[PDB]
Design a protein around this ligand. Structure first.
Ligand SMILES: Nc1ncnc2c1ncn2[C@@H]1O[C@H](COP(=O)(O)OP(=O)(O)OP(=O)(O)O)[C@@H](O)[C@H]1O
Lengths: 115, 206, 155, 108
RNA sequence: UGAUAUUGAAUGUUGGUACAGCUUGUACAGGAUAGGUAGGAGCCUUGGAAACCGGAGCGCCAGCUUCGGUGGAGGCAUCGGU
């Protein structure tokens, strides 16, 4: 039973995962578009991000959270939907923080697609 | 109470005319076993059950069972048992039987005429047959082709009741879903030889 | 068309029930311009509705349409490789159009011998919303809700 | 035998009337239902699986509202996903979104 | 590779056996969560009835369970019906 937590939203182009943890990063609960039965294109859509956030939130509310800090990673379109969905579940969102990993010129990226 | 072997079959052979049905079957039924006897049509499942019950004597082999063991046998020719229901009222404690009956959805069986009791739905026959067997307080249940005619109600009832049952249960069924809820072992009878699988029916398939 | 929206056409209210909806259904039932046949069918049907239920036929009919008229329909859009069904709100006029059309078509498919009887039974089913036409409305609402993600898309 | 029967009956172009309490077999074969309920036979134009999983229409006159409002939420939510917060268009969509969410709460 | 002898000690976990305690028991109707059998019209009661509250387990979502704090005279039945 913990109150304050961080909501890690990993929004990629293919899927949106939402893990909810305590302030010390111990996992309370998590949800992802795939876990909710979305497949392929559907998982990417922002609608699925909403549903993923709601499902993750309702799992956490059992443990008794009230305030969430939000961290967003990846280039997906889910972050806004997932954040608004967390607010709609009742948990107040203190601050959103983009923590997408930025290399300072490190590893060579994979070759560009010729689509 | 325990898992002491209740029925032990060894070298059970049975033939009809020139057709071998059972060829050298060694198996044991222990207390608390929920065994699904599966196999395609004509493989001998009813024949086997009748031999286990004692309706048919085998050609070779021995059947070891407690001398006092009471074996409740659902059988396939329900028609015969249900026609004797009028006789069964005198032999079975009315109370228990009717208690079950109402649960199975046969309400107010007391009031049914002999006409209706001879005109029953095949699903009613089974519900009445099931209630009778369970009121006799058998120590070993054999259920040949149950849930054949049962509705959602009688299937929920037969499941919840099988789980409660204390003795062993041998269920002969083709119904994947009924097996996937009640049984933990599959006896597959093919080419007159029984093979053994652990778990329910779905994993048996795999 | 490209120029812009075009003047819709008015209908006169039915002589007996003084209802434009009734008149519109009469037009939907008409075949080969034989408006006589369709008026007779509808009036006979409304007698069956009053004679069967006992309620006013118009009240039953209006209740039936309420249960048939859809609120969200789906429009197809070819997005690259896969075609997406985009949910779109149904204009009030279109709601009435679809209701009458669906009612008439599925009524024609029923198993009664005469259209008036058929139509009557269909309206009664829609009153209790258990007929084919109702089912059609269920389907569109399912499609819209299922493809709710793609509502963003639109022309 | 059951599998072969299932294959054959799916192809058969005539009328099939089947009674079965194996709902899987029914749900594969049957597209319409005659339900025996309360000493009445009612015909339903739906598959066995859909009929059981129905949900009473007690608020079916209100689901229409919940359907239209929610579909508007989806449209505005979709657009917001594509636009940077710094665009002036963001502000208008967010106000409507929160206002529409209040309506959703009121209907529930 | 296993059993066993050489081959001992302590702890923890997990099954079986015997005993004891805590207790545990919902078809429908019926007043409602009715385990079976037996006696049964008195039993309990400042040695705290009912009722209020808090705590806890179970739960078919009806609810029962007991550690308790306020509370102070009833509460329960065979009769009745089901
Ligand atoms: N008394 C008998 N005399 C001759 N042949 C028999 C006899 N009993 C069964 N058979 C045949 O021997 C085989 C055994 O059939 P049995 O009834 O035991 O099978 P089953 O597993 O119960 O099949 P199903 O599920 O179709 O009822 C079948 O070929 C049956 O035709």
């Amino acid at each position: 039973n913990i109150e304050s937590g961080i909501a890690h939203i990993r929004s990629t182009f293919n899927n949106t995962i939402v893990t909810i943890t305590d302030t010390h990063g111990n996992a309370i609960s998590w949800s992802s578009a795939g876990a909710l039965g979305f497949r392929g294109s559907r998982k990417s859509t922002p609608f699925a991000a909403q549903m993923a956030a709601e499902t993750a939130a309702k799992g956490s509310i059992e443990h008794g959270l009230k305030t969430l800090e939000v961290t967003v990673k990846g280039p997906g379109s889910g972050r806004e939907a997932a954040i608004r969905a967390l607010q709609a579940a009742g948990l107040e969102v203190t601050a959103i923080r983009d923590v997408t990993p930025v290399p300072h010129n490190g590893c060579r990226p994979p070759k560009r697609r010729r689509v | 109470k325990n898992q002491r072997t209740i029925v032990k079959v060894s070298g059970l052979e049975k033939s009809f005319h020139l057709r071998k049905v059972l060829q050298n079957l060694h198996f044991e039924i222990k207390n608390g076993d929920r065994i699904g006897l599966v196999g395609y049509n004509g493989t001998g499942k009813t024949t086997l059950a009748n031999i286990i019950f004692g309706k048919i004597t085998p050609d070779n082999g021995l059947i070891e069972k407690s001398r006092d063991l009471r074996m409740g046998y659902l059988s396939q020719s329900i028609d015969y048992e249900v026609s004797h229901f009028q006789q069964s009222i005198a032999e079975v404690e009315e109370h228990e039987l009717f208690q079950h009956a109402s649960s199975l959805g046969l309400n107010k069986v007391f009031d049914w005429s002999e006409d209706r009791l001879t005109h029953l739905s095949g699903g009613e026959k089974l519900k009445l047959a099931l209630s009778m067997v369970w009121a006799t307080k058998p120590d070993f249940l054999i259920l040949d082709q149950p849930t054949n005619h049962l509705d959602f109600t009688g299937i929920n009832w037969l499941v919840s009741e099988l789980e409660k049952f204390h003795g062993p249960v041998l269920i002969i069924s083709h119904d994947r879903h009924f097996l996937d809820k009640t049984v933990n072992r599959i006896f597959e009878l093919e080419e007159s030889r029984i093979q053994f699988f652990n778990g329910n029916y779905s994993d048996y398939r795999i | 068309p490209r120029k812009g929206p075009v003047a819709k056409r008015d209908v006169l209210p039915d002589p007996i029930y003084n209802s434009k909806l009734v008149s519109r259904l009469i037009n939907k039932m008409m075949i080969d311009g034989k408006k006589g046949k369709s008026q007779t069918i509808l009036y006979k049907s409304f007698d069956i509705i009053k004679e069967r239920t006992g309620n006013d036929a118009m009240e039953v009919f209006e209740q039936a349409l309420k249960n048939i008229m859809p609120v969200l329909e789906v429009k197809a859009r070819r997005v690259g490789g896969a075609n997406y069904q985009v949910p779109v709100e149904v204009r009030p006029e279109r709601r009435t159009t679809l209701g009458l059309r669906w009612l008439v078509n599925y009524a024609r498919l029923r198993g009664e011998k005469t259209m008036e009887e058929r139509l009557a039974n269909e309206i009664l089913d829609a009153a209790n919303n258990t007929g084919a036409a109702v089912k059609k409305r269920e389907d569109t609402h399912k499609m819209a809700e299922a493809n709710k993600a793609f509502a963003h898309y639109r022309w | 035998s059951r599998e072969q029967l299932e294959q054959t009956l799916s192809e058969f172009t005539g009328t099939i009337i089947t009674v079965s309490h194996d709902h899987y077999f029914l749900n594969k074969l049957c597209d319409r239902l005659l339900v025996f309920e309360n000493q009445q036979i009612k015909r339903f134009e739906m598959k066995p699986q859909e009929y059981l999983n129905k949900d009473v229409k007690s608020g079916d006159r209100s689901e229409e509202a919940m359907l239209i409002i929610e579909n508007k939420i989806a449209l505005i939510l979709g657009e917001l996903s594509l636009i940077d917060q710094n665009n002036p268009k963001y502000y208008r969509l967010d106000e409507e979104f929160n206002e529409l969410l209040k309506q959703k709460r009121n209907l529930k």
